[PDB]
């Protein structure tokens, strides 16, 4: 199945997924002297008071922290967004070096890794329905840099211990994700999809301009993770983020 190596990587997705060559597709190169400050864009406004972590999970492609969703407690509203969106998971990709793993890219530079925050405009009742609606999605994604290291994401770090390969969770409740942002909230937005199959074409991309920074020793804790299922050879957990795709005629508008 599906994964991030030479067999089965991002240039074998299309043959499953034909979407991977679609229209809209993320993620993508951010221009920064292409995208245009957009003055109809509201505030971003992001509500992570009430945020409620249920566990986190080895998905033997990345690690999700999962929320609560079954009330309206922590959402993403404002900017580019009609409505509110609830917070569903969380989860990263990165690379194997400090100098590659996010997903997108500024004016071609790669971060060491990139924070999606996942959300779903909850007009469509639930994630299920809203993954079905061009405009059911809200990504929130912020780039990591190597440097001093994020305390709020220590509690992540440390738990990754008891999830080292596929299929294996832990409990993971009191997270509050409040700890994973940078202070500004200057954003690029523009339409795209999920950046891993089924590969939808049902997100808001909202990517934050600011990084945060986090340690050597937090992202290598990243690396230590296993792609391979207890029992199995090991496949360190490295490098599982899909390249830049085409814009198409999209237009990315900024916040500032
Ligand atoms: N990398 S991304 O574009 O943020 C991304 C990719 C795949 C995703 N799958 C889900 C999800 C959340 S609940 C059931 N599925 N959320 C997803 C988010
Ligand atoms: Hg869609
Ligand atoms: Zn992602």
Same mark, same amino acid.
């Given at each position: 199945?599906?994964? &991030? ?42 509500? &992570?008071? $009430?945020?409620?972590?249920? +566990? ?28 509110? &969106? +609830?917070?569903? $998971? ?7 070096? #400090? ?31 809203? @993954? ?23 509690? @992540?770090? #440390? @738990? ?22 940078? =202070?500004?909230?200057? &954003? ?11 590969? *939808? ?6 990517? *934050?301009?600011?990084?945060?920074? @986090?340690?050597? =020793?937090?992202? *290598? ?17 490295? #490098? ?6 085409? *814009?198409?005629? +999209? ?6």
């Amino acid at each position: 199945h599906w994964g &991030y190596g030479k067999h089965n990587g991002p240039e074998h997705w299309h043959k499953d997924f034909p979407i991977a060559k679609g229209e809209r597709q993320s993620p993508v190169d951010i221009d920064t002297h292409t995208a245009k400050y957009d003055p109809s864009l509201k505030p971003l406004s992001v509500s &992570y008071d $009430q945020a409620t972590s249920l +566990r986190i999970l080895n998905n033997g492609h990345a690690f999700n922290v999962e929320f609560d969703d079954s009330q309206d407690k922590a959402v993403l509203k404002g900017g580019p967004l009609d409505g509110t &969106y +609830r917070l569903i $998971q969380f989860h990263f990709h990165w690379g194997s070096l #400090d100098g590659q793993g996010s997903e997108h890219t500024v004016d071609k530079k790669k971060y060491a890794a990139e924070l999606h925050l996942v959300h779903w405009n909850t007009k469509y009742g639930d994630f299920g329905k809203a @993954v079905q609606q061009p405009d059911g999605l809200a990504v929130l994604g912020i780039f990591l840099k190597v440097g001093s290291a994020k305390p709020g994401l220590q509690k @992540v770090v #440390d @738990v990754l211990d008891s999830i080292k390969t596929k299929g294996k969770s832990a409990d993971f409740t009191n997270f509050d994700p409040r700890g994973l942002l940078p =202070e500004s909230l200057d &954003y690029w937005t523009y339409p795209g999809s999920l950046t891993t199959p089924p590969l *939808l074409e049902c997100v808001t991309w909202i990517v *934050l301009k600011e990084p945060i920074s @986090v340690s050597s =020793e937090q992202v *290598l804790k990243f690396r230590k993770l296993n792609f391979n299922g207890e029992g199995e050879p090991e496949e360190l957990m490295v #490098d599982n983020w899909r390249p830049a795709q085409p *814009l198409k005629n +999209r237009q990315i508008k900024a916040s500032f």
